[PDB]
Amino acid sequence: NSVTVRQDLERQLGELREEFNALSQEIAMSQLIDLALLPLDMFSMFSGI
Amino acid sequence: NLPITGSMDTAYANSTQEETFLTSTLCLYYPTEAATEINDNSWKDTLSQLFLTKGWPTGSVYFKEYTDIASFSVDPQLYCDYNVVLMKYDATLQLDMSELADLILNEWLCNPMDITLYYYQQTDEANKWISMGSSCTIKVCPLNTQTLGIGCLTTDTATFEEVATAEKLVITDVVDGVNHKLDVTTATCTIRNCKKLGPRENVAVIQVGGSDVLDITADPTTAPQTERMMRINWKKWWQVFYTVVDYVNQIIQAMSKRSRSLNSAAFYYRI
Amino acid sequence: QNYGINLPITGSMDTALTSTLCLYYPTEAATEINDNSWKDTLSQLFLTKGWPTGSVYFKEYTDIASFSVDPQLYCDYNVVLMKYDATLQLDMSELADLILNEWLCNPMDITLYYYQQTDEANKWISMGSSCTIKVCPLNTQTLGIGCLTTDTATFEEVATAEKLVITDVVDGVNHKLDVTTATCTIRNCKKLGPRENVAVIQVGGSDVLDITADPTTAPQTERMMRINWKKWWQVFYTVVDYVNQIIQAMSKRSRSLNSAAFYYRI
Amino acid sequence: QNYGINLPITGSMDTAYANSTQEETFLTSTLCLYYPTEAATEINDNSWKDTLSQLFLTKGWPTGSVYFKEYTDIASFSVDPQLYCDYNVVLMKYDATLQLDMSELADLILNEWLCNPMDITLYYYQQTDEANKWISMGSSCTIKVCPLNTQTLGIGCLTTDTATFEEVATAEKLVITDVVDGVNHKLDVTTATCTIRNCKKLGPRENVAVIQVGGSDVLDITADPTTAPQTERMMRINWKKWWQVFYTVVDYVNQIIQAMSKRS
Amino acid sequence: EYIENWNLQNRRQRTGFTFHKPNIFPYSASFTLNRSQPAHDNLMGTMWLNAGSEIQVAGFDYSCAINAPANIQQFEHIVQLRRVLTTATITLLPDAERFSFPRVINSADGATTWYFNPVILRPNNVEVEFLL
Amino acid sequence: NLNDNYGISRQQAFNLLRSDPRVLREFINQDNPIIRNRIEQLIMQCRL
């Protein structure tokens, strides 16, 4: 019982694009290609979040 | 729009200043106090003859009067091919004049904002809300994903955040990516969602007196003075008009043809 | 670090607690807002820009004069919203001079010792409830010029009821100092360089700040912004929306251990 | 060297820099400080000029070179300002209501002018080019102008009826008038209390610097609206006591001088 | 060498001339504006000099690719040699000093002039391809 | 560029043409500048 809890604002998408593009340089190529052969299904992709 | 390949060895063409003066129109916008202080019914013809000495054919120069900055800001219609706005400086109206400059020194692509039924947000830094009218009192209520308001209740406008009161023109910039509920007096105001595309090159603003205070960009980190923002100290309006006439070539040099293909409805004074 | 400070950094041209934000605003701003929950709204709006919940902090100061009394810089990034008053120009400049730069200050005992300013980076910064700095330059024989070392009424006054004042006297000259030591304190400060983690946004007015005592230069750095305003809500909205640009002008690598505006050495 | 526009001077890009000449120029030059009467009023000391001279001596200037000239205010100072030192510094108090006048004063003392007399009673006058202006100085300078067409008849004015003329100055102490070039004008000025001169702006006056005390960048020493240059001889400071202003001027005198070039 | 090649040509054999700094590129200092306006304040394009054995090219964006799709602006220069060069040794360097200082450049039709105020950034994803 | 500067095997060319991951990883782990540069460009094109 209380005034309904407010779900706070998350992030404007431009900031997110900046952040993901900045993460893009942290990727290892051998390991990336090794990941790029595992058939990521729904379970596989949404279990590690 | 096609690629334009040019040679760096090409020869400069002769001065086109006379041709553009002959085939274009000039509009001068001045406050009513200018005509009051001048106190002469034939001053338009005197300035026209002086411009003719400068090269402009008779009738190409058009003189338009506005009561004051606040009144001029209500849908400023700029007619001629080249527009020069003589804006008197008032230390109390630094934002308002700036807003006016921001409205007329830039190209804006605007669409209607039907606030009473729709929820609006700003997508990027180029997006603003331009509201114009006799009295624009805008209150804003930021919202969240659950549609609730932040420090505001969508059902109680009294809690909406006040961003403008009794404004003839106001450019509202809010946080991007956030939906807001808007409450503005639609009877005496009209609010439009606008994107600034780029500079409007055929409009120059001459600030008569004061200091450089115009800020035509909402970004706090930039306060650029383009070549179309002039500033002249003054004590007599006749001197102001004489210096405008004498340096007309310099003023037009700082200006370029509009170049934009519009969709709006505005009359023009063209030759 | 210190053992590798005096070492080169070679780079190739062909190669290709989290941060906290403090907002210093005048109390009249909060009065104009008239809302008792505006801080939460601004915190969430900042969180839209990527600042976690408990990162942004809002610090209120009564006015420019009061804020200048030993200012404290708390967060990683310090954006100071300073209202412009044509009658307080110098004071504003002084605050900026004390806030946008790093200083190294030593105690000054004016009663027992004369003092001189060695170079252009040396100033005398005094702060407190009210300062009244009176200066008597001396000569090689230690006799006052246009002043009497015994008679303090002949001293030349350079400050009157100042909450903060940065005094610049002629270098290489000894000065006898009369300061209201009871109500304020003076220190011999050296300007080290820019303080990159503090930005100053002047709300309204024109560009009048002068953070350098030299008359030949009045540099407007990227950390000195100016905005026209009518409603404080618009001011805070433009501060929030362009927080990216504001932080870009700053560097997080100037936050000392303590919040003081000057390093202090005995 | 002098002003060698007439003849070429050839120099190598390898000639070793000579030592600093700051001490030599300080020894062999004079310095004038122009300050308003308010500065003297706030500085109640009767020997403050002597103290400033001593402080300058601590900075190198000999004890016969620093001079202090007092003017009542900008409007009065603007009446034929005479600057006779090798280096001239004008502490100019800022008032928002006199901006143009300030600018005019600066425009007159920060630039070199070649002036000729004017007989508004005898001849019509026109301004040949952008550098040509009409500088009027005196106790009260009221200037009215009537432009003329190619037939010598006035435009929006009657040459005989001065009341119909267009007013460009009223009760001014100094005013720079800029009219449309190539147009003859019938002028009407108060020759009793005003002298008007036909002047050409040759270029900057490099031995005169203006330190604007308080305010903002409002000086416009160019008639052209599109340009408002801030030269390195146009300084601005913030102030609350005049003693601090004078101490700042004394301490950074080397920087002020290097921003200026000696008298030719 | 020249008489040897003359005899080979007469016999209709393969000829060959060695050139140090061959004069293969006709002089041409030109530019192309892929984005332009009458005021020439937001320009995107590339300017080049092909002189003798030298090709300097410089791609410029006035907006610094802020509004570009991936914040990347792609520049391309194709130079067609009038004869086939073989066994060529070339030096490639990542900056064009010729187009690295401010200048005033006539417009394509000579109607006006625009201003160029370069600030040099390293070229990205450089690819030089020699085609036959 | 590979097959010129790096004379690649018949099997390696067969695999590279058909995007066989085995040859791609063997070349990447080999620190082959050409294929690593290509793959870095492909990764950098992954931009929101």
Ligand SMILES: *[C@@H]1O[C@H](CO)[C@@H](O)[C@H](O)[C@H]1NC(C)=O
């Ligand atoms: C351009 O000006 C020159 C020199 O004034 C003149 O000879 C020429 O006829 C003019 N017109 C053209 C098209 O060159």
Ligand SMILES: *[C@@H]1O[C@H](CO)[C@@H](O)[C@H](O)[C@H]1NC(C)=O
């Ligand atoms: C110039 O400076 C140098 C080095 O300080 C000194 O040795 C020399 O005597 C000075 N004077 C001249 C005329 O070179």
Ligand SMILES: [Ca+2]
């Ligand atoms: Ca307004």
Ligand SMILES: [Ca+2]
């Ligand atoms: Ca509220």
Ligand SMILES: [Ca+2]
């Ligand atoms: Ca926005």
Ligand SMILES: [Ca+2]
């Ligand atoms: Ca701005």
Ligand SMILES: [Ca+2]
């Ligand atoms: Ca103070």
Ligand SMILES: [Ca+2]
């Ligand atoms: Ca005294």
Ligand SMILES: [Ca+2]
């Ligand atoms: Ca000092």
Ligand SMILES: [Ca+2]
């Ligand atoms: Ca300064």
Ligand SMILES: [Ca+2]
């Ligand atoms: Ca005047």
Ligand SMILES: [Ca+2]
């Ligand atoms: Ca008349």
Ligand SMILES: [Ca+2]
């Ligand atoms: Ca003129």
Ligand SMILES: [Ca+2]
């Ligand atoms: Ca000007």
Ligand SMILES: [Cl-]
């Ligand atoms: Cl060679």
Ligand SMILES: [Zn+2]
């Ligand atoms: Zn062009």
